[PDB]
Amino acid sequence: TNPAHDHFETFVQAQLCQDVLSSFQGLCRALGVESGGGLSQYHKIKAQLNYWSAKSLWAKLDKRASQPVYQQGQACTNTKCLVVGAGPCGLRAAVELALLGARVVLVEKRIKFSRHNVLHLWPFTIHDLRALGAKKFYGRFCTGTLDHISIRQLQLLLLKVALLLGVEIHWGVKFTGLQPPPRKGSGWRAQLQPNPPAQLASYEFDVLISAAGGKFVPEGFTIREMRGKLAIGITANFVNGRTVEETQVPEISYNQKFFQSLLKATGIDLENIVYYKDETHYFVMTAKKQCLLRLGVLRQDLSETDQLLGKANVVPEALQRFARAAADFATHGKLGKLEFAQDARGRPDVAAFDFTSMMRAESSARVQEKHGARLLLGLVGDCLVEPFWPLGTGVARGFLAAFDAAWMVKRWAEGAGPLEVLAERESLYQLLSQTSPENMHRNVAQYGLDPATRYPNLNLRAVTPNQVQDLYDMMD
Numbered sequence: 325t326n327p328a329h330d331h332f333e334t335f336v337q338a339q340l341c342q343d344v345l346s347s348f349q350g351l352c353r354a355l356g357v358e359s360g361g362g363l364s365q366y367h368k369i370k371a372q373l374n375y376w377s378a379k380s381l382w383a384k385l386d387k388r389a390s391q392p393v394y395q396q397g398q399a400c401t402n403t404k405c406l407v408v409g410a411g412p413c414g415l416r417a418a419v420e421l422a423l424l425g426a427r428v429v430l431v432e433k434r435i436k437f438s439r440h441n442v443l444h445l446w447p448f449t450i451h452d453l454r455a456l457g458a459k460k461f462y463g464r465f466c467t468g469t470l471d472h473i474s475i476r477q478l479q480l481l482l483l484k485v486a487l488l489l490g491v492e493i494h495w496g497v498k499f500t501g502l503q504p505p506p507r508k509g510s511g512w513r514a515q516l517q518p519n520p521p522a523q524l525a526s527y528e529f530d531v532l533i534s535a536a537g538g539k540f541v542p543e544g545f546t547i548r549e550m551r552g553k554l555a556i557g558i559t560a561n562f563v564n565g566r567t568v569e570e571t572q573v574p575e576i577s578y579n580q581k582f583f584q585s586l587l588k589a590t591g592i593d594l595e596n597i598v599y600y601k602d603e604t605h606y607f608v609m610t611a612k613k614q615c616l617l618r619l620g621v622l623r624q625d626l627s628e629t630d631q632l633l634g635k636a637n638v639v640p641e642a643l644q645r646f647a648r649a650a651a652d653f654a655t656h657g658k659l660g661k662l663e664f665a666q667d668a669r670g671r672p673d674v675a676a677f678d679f680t681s682m683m684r685a686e687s688s689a690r691v692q693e694k695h696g697a698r699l700l701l702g703l704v705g706d707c708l709v710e711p712f713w714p715l716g717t718g719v720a721r722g723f724l725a726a727f728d729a730a731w732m733v734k735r736w737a738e739g740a741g742p743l744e745v746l747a748e749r750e751s752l753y754q755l756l757s758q759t760s761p762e763n764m765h766r767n768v769a770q771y772g773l774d775p776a777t778r779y780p781n782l783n784l785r786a787v788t789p790n791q792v793q794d795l796y797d798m799m800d
């Protein structure tokens with residue numbers, strides 16, 4: 325037997341977040357290496373795992389790792405990064421930084437991946453994951469003409485790569501803010517909860533990339549907030565037994581006469597509903613507040629969206645008989661008595677969500693300088709832009725914010741100059757909405773950090789550094 329061979333293989337097969345870390349520390353032990361020690365650790369790992377079950381992955385990884393851009397991992401060799409949040413994008417950012425050769429510390433306030441909700445995928449993201457060795461880390465990946473990963477399956481897959489490329493990950497730790505460098509001869513340090521491990525508290529860094537999801541407002545940035553008429557969104561996951569007759573029900577994605585025939589037997593009033601068949605029978609529907617008060621899923625009509633959706637106002641029981649009512653008729657009962665999958669809490673996976681307010685940051689980047697040290701702050705993903713989930717551009721643009729944040733760190737580690745690096749980034753960010761698979765570079769395969777492999781007719785000078793004068797924060 326060969327502990328190293330065995331540990332790598334359960335590590336790859338791992339379906340629990342606490343088991344990715346477990347088997348990995350074991351592989352590190354077996355290969356006489358450490359985790360969170362960068363590419364020198366990655367290089368020591370791969371060389372000693374020169375065997376059938378691993379070699380195709382190193383080719384894939386190194387092929388990317390040696391794309392013209394990363395300078396064979398020498399570009400950001402003098403850059404210390406802090407990445408906040410281990411959602412899909414944050415991890416993608418870490419991967420990108422790891423490859424650029426930056427020191428990568430990722431902090432994350434949870435301790436597991438418990439979200440089942442299925443995410444639609446763009447042709448280009450599908451391929452990106454494939455090139456990162458998704459097919460080894462995940463069996464049922466974009467399986468068939470299917471183009472959807474589940475949140476946790478994505479996170480697991482990405483985490484395994486983050487670890488391989490030597491990202492230092494700390495769990496159960498909350499980013500709160502920043503410690504200003506107290507003197508002429510210090511650097512920027514984070515502010516973490518609950519009390520972080522010795523080194524992490526003293527870990528200094530010039531690049532902070534926060535991918536801490538929609539709800540986190542990072543100090544200094546201005547968030548624009550558009551509100552329209554209310555849209556309540558229900559999501560539901562039912563267990564996929566994958567029985568022959570259970571896997572013979574087509575996927576779905578008020579206009580058609582179906583949304584009309586839904587009111588007949590069930591009396592459920594929905595404008596649109598979506599079905600995905602993944603690890604779970606995924607359903608997402610947009611409900612009318614008019615009928616949610618009627619069939620008593622919401623207890624009482626509160627005029628302010630936020631309050632109308634609290635744990636108190638939402639009846640959990642009726643939400644299940646509402647969700648299964650829509651799900652049962654939607655498949656014409658071809659899936660039988662559907663049982664919910666659980667959280668997170670043993671609670672059944674069903675949630676009433678908000679679709680009313682779309683948060684967008686005014687700038688995607690900000691630089692802070694105090695007593696000599698420069699700090700580059702970048703947003704990536706949901707905290708940069710809040711996506712209309714029915715359209716499904718979240719993973720697409722998060723991954724884009726990630727690529728365009730890594731390009732920023734590249735120019736940064738060339739000393740390009742605060743006002744400039746921002747102007748490049750902000751010229752690219754001005755595109756982040758327009759972006760569709762329709763208006764972007766056709767050769768998906770050729771996609772890389774160089775933003776012009778992605779954006780046709782790109783203008784790096786759409787914003788002059790004189791238009792961003794106050795995104796640079798000279799505190800003295």
Ligand SMILES: Cc1cc2nc3c(=O)[nH]c(=O)nc-3n(C[C@H](O)[C@H](O)[C@H](O)COP(=O)(O)OP(=O)(O)OC[C@H]3O[C@@H](n4cnc5c(N)ncnc54)[C@H](O)[C@@H]3O)c2cc1C
Pocket residue numbers: 408409410411412413414431432433434441442443444445475497498499500535536537538540559704705706707711713714715716717718719720722
């Ligand atoms: C039900 C649902 C359906 C969706 N539909 C689609 C779809 O069909 N297609 C599509 O492409 N996208 C879809 N979206 C959007 C997509 O899920 C998100 O945009 C995506 O998760 C973005 O990843 P993220 O890392 O930016 O955000 P998140 O996944 O929310 O990552 C944030 C993470 O950072 C952590 N965090 C927050 N604050 C701190 C802190 N202070 N310190 C440390 N960690 C912190 C949290 O633990 C969290 O894990 C959907 C989303 C949901 C929820």
Ligand SMILES: [Cl-]
Pocket residue numbers: 339340341342435436437438
């Ligand atoms: Cl987990």
